[PDB]
Amino acid sequence: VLSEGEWQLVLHVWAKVEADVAGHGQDILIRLFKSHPETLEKFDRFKHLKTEAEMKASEDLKKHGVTVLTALGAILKKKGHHEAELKPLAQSHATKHKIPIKYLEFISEAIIHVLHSRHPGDFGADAQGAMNKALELFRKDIAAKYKELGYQG
Ligand code: HEM
């Protein structure tokens, strides 16, 4: 678990993301899709995309990015008390979307990359560590629901 001081560093860095949710969301998805191409194949909605230029021009992609980051931001602000908001996402991703837990690890690495590139010399190592912990908490809990259903993969 995180300490109050660590949760503060997490929510403080999330304030930068909320200033431009659509922007940070577009950068995250593209970094994920370009770095791990297998993840894009999981989206029937976006699989027609082939180049970064095409991904950059898609308004629908940004629309879903905002949907995703909005849901994530709501979870982080619960400071660990996310049981209710994590259940439906675990059910939908494990059984309907067929998303491996490993992909959750990928998306977590994409967030740290975006924050550093977009905020040069403004994303501290202390904050990076706090964000790491919050994301690992989220993952551990997700995997617990996945295992229950019979997935966890
Ligand atoms: C921080 C990570 C994640 C969050 C908070 C998140 C959140 C969401 C939300 C809110 C939706 C909307 C309704 C639903 O639950 O089905 C959704 C849909 C979906 N998610 Fe995620 N997701 C995450 C990671 C992933 C990853 C890693 C993949 C794939 C590699 C993925 C694939 C999908 C797909 C395929 C859908 C439906 C897209 C569509 O056709 O509209 N998600 N996700």
Q: How distant, in Å, are the alpha carbons of 27, 59, 101, 131, 137 from that of 106?
A: 14, 23, 9, 14, 15
Residue 104 backbone zone (phi > 0: left; psi -120 to 50: alpha; other: beta): alpha
72 lines ligand 1 (CB under 6 A): yes
Return the structure tokens found at 15. 């304030």
Q: Report whether 86 contacts 142 (CB < 8 A).
A: yes
Instruction: List phi, psi (to 5°) of 103.
Output: -65, -30
- Dihedral of alpha carbons 3, 22, 25, 68, sign: positive
Give the mutation target among 24, 77, 93 for probing the ligand 1 site: most ligand atoms within 8 A of CB.
93
* C-alpha span between 44 and 96 (Å, rounded): 13
* C-alpha span between 108 and 52 (Å, rounded): 20
Contacts of 38 (CB under 8 A, 6+ apart): none
* C-alpha span between 20 and 16 (Å, rounded): 7
CATH of domain 1-153: 1.10.490.10
Q: Which residue has the tokens 């949710």?
A: 21
* C-alpha span between 103 and 59 (Å, rounded): 23
* C-alpha span between 2 and 10 (Å, rounded): 10
Ligand 1 centre to CA of 35 (Å) is 17
Which residues carry a binding-site annotation for nitrite?
Answer: 64
* C-alpha span between 61 and 16 (Å, rounded): 20
Header resolution in angstroms: 2.0
Domain boundaries, the chain: 1-153
Ligand 1 centre to CA of 68 (Å) is 7
Give the mutation target among 10, 43, 68, 151 for probing the ligand 1 site: most ligand atoms within 8 A of CB.
68
* Strand ranges, E, within the chain: none
Segment (H or E) for 146:
helix 125-149
Residue-level length of the chain: 153
DSSP designation for 119: S
